[PDB]
Amino acid sequence: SMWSGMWRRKLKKLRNALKKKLKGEK
């Protein structure tokens, strides 16, 4: 595989983090 076992959760984490950064914090 090209992707590690963790992938979707990493994308979820990325999304969450991006939204956090985009919004502010809360």
Swiss-Prot record:
GO terms for cellular component: extracellular region. One of its GO terms (molecular function) is toxin activity. One of its GO terms (biological process) is defense response to fungus. Keywords: Antibiotic, Antimicrobial, Cytolysis, Fungicide, Hemolysis, Secreted, Signal, Toxin. Transmembrane segments: none annotated. Expressed by the venom gland. Cleavage of the propeptide depends on the processing quadruplet motif (XXXR, with at least one of X being E). It comes from the Eukaryota. Belongs to the cationic peptide 03 (latarcin) family. 01 subfamily. The mature peptide (63-87) probably forms alpha-helices which disrupt target cell membranes. Has antimicrobial activity against Gram-positive bacteria (A.globiformis VKM Ac-1112 (MIC=0.5 uM), and B.subtilis VKM B-501 (MIC=1.0 uM)), Gram-negative bacteria (E.coli DH5-alpha (MIC=1.0 uM), E.coli MH1 (MIC=0.7 uM), and P.aeruginosa PAO1 (MIC=4.1 uM)), and yeasts (P.pastoris GS115 (MIC=17 uM), and S.cerevisiae Y190 (MIC>33 uM)). Has a moderate hemolytic activity against rabbit erythrocytes. Causes paralysis, but is not lethal when injected into insect (M.domestica) larvae. This is M-zodatoxin-Lt1a. The chain holds residues 63 to 88 of 88 of the full protein.
